[PDB]
Write a protein that binds this DNA or RNA. Structure first.
Ligand code: HIS
Ligand code: HIS
Ligand code: HIS
Ligand code: HIS
Ligand code: HIS
Ligand code: HIS
Ligand code: MG
Ligand code: MG
Ligand code: MG
Ligand code: MG
Ligand code: MG
Ligand code: MG
Lengths: 147, 147, 147, 147, 147, 147
RNA sequence: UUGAGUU
RNA sequence: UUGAGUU
RNA sequence: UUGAGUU
RNA sequence: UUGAGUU
RNA sequence: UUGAGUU
RNA sequence: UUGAGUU
């Protein structure tokens, strides 16, 4: 059962979709026990998007830098989020398109039961389009996994 | 070029994620010239999700009830939104999973140039999981198309 | 090397797109040594499309009715043709859409070298759309396989 | 309801699958109000195929060179046509295969009702195979979208 | 780093492919600390395959019957295994095909580092084909996930 | 009907999953009439995996070096095997992952009826992961086709 | 169309 | 890793 | 959950 | 073709 | 197998 | 954009 006040997906998205000069939403989430990471990446190569998210998550301490387990969890969460962004073919430059994204990675337990342990949510928001400024529209993606 | 104050995707998602009893965001969006539709649907059949969105959009006047053009635009926008929700296989019951969703459909011009005409965004948010209450996690999907 | 006068794909499509009452293209193709089958099928169930094509092919003698080999070749050729028709998700009714198709199955050697043996082409043409007459557009699909 | 004499998909394919030294089929379609573009492109990179179609369509006046709306419509129509060509994975060189294609882009209203506005069809025909002349078979793809 | 003597994938597959009446490989694996489950299921409905695997895994104690975490891990491992079996479209009956499978689910730590925790492997082996005995060929699938 | 003693899929996998210094399993299969090829390939480019399998199969005489028919059969069998390895997106480096594989290609008739002719099985086993030694897990894939 | 559900 | 780009 | 099936 | 690799 | 259909 | 190519 998901705890209404701990909906990791909704929280990650609301954080990513805000632009307040000083909302202190990060410190607030962290005070509540969440591990948070925010970043931005633009590219015509999906691997660069994946790497940016991984590197930011490890530097911010959202997931362990050592071992495979947590990296495995984050990779699959990122893949799931990329599905929403790419919608069918997980390709960018090869299909003549580019993305400009902001991302958020949140880690914690969104359930009422503490036995559910930690989960991770990767949320993406930005634009996708032809490699010409302006010829683009918005894109979103959210991936959730246990960790 | 997307107009900062008219980002259809971001606006549709923000509307979907708010539970304010008396927010009046719908009237505000409509005042700004947007055509808006909000609804909810849960099912183990993707076709029921698609139908709920189409029916709600036509009843609320977001898209024309007659003709094919606008229905065609809405169908593909819905398909794109479903990619984020299903992440790989656009199947629910056949893969032993069910979804409970809230949706928003927004229609208007998000660009600086009026020549870009109307576009439509279909946003979905809820939970996806096994057919047992509680064995689920959040899911999101956003599809954008010209109309 | 494909023989210019024996392009199985192009020939199957041309046969499918002609509505000439008394064309006699079938007899002409058969005179050239091709095994040909023409049919029609409409449905919201992909399996009914596959079955119609298989049954027609076996009844007309385009592929052997006994054994698995030729049925295996035809099944995969049909799957490839369905990709062009469905474009992403090989689903019809489950995604609230229906198809009305005409199909042609051609069998023979399209290469200059006789050692290439027989190949088979499955071509589909018709309309796909919402379950309401008129809310539809054209669809095409061609699958080619060795047999 | 599709107008029998204005079936954009069938017309685009019949144009592409003809090789008459002088059929004047282009001028005929244009006389009937259709905007037409014909071209050819070969590559192991899908983005080069997409770009060739876009550039030819804009140079021939089939779609507006300015703005995003029409480019958006053409991109998705091209993606749909590529599904028929690639059948599963929208990849060429990465999967050790190459394509040699001829393409046609047709724009106009294929419906009886003028309210349906303009639609666009992208049709592809050629060969796909290993990067060795002769080790190939035919391939086809048709994508249709509103514009 | 995977431990040579604890390769969960290889071990699960070897267990699945052995028909030795009195092999006692299950007891041996359990002696080594692995949690093991073996079963069989045939169907034209993918959801029945998923359900059989889940039910067998929970009854045999390979994964916890309560909570979502472990069920979530098993579901995704099963999905990955199904990719190898279905190869493109995770559909059986809808594409006029049926499967007869034997499955094995193994749980334990395959790495040298104990900090990697438990992982789970779902392996499938059997036949897939038309709904007519004999018109079929073999199929395999292996999915691995952290748990 | 598949012959119990000639299950091409199971045989190819058991061969690949063995590491005996001298099992003479190759000569045994060859004595039984099977054409066999064993190899290994690691890469972040799927095309290199495909090429390694093709080249080894042609050098070992498992398939004809001349003509297209047999190369066509092997290519599609390899594609099917890659589905089990990639599980969703047939991409490696582009999705920031690499594979280290051993492969086996077996050719012969696995059915009781000699009329079924030759079939081919491509089996893959190894590891897939991030481009960092140790951050990986096992992967498997089996593709079967008529030839 | 007005948020689904058990193997 | 500190929001991409022209066929 | 204890290996499916006809167009 | 004679088992890949760091963001 | 002899061209489908309403949320 | 004016039909690609070898492991
Ligand atoms: N509209 C495309 C992006 C794009 C490529 N070229 C133009 N637009 C998408 O939905 O991903
Ligand atoms: N976790 C699945 C849903 C599910 C099915 N069973 C359990 N959970 C998903 O990501 O869609
Ligand atoms: N336009 C859809 C079919 C459809 C469903 N609903 C309306 N139209 C397609 O391209 O397949
Ligand atoms: N036959 C492959 C193309 C190919 C690659 N290598 C040999 N042939 C296809 O259907 O796309
Ligand atoms: N050959 C198909 C199964 C099948 C359906 N009909 C005949 N055979 C596969 O590879 O899945
Ligand atoms: N775990 C991924 C591979 C990977 C990439 N990065 C880390 N691991 C898979 O299943 O393919
Ligand atoms: Mg993995
Ligand atoms: Mg459409
Ligand atoms: Mg098969
Ligand atoms: Mg788009
Ligand atoms: Mg999940
Ligand atoms: Mg082929």
């Amino acid at each position: 059962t998901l705890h209404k006040e701990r909906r990791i997906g909704r929280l990650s998205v609301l954080l990513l979709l805000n632009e307040a000069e000083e909302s202190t939403q990060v410190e607030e989430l962290e005070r509540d026990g969440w591990k948070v990471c925010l970043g931005k990446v633009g590219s015509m190569d999906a691997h660069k998007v994946i790497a940016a998210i991984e590197t930011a998550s490890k530097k911010s301490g959202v997931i362990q830098s050592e071992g495979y387990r947590e990296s495995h969890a984050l990779y699959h969460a990122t893949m799931e989020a990329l599905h929403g962004v790419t919608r069918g073919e997980m390709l960018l430059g090869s299909l003549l398109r580019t993305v400009g994204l902001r991302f958020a990675v949140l880690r914690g337990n969104p359930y009422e039961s503490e036995a559910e342990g930690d989960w991770i949510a990767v949320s993406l928001y930005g634009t996708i389009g032809a490699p010409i400024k302006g010829l683009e529209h918005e894109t979103f993606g959210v991936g959730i996994n246990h960790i």
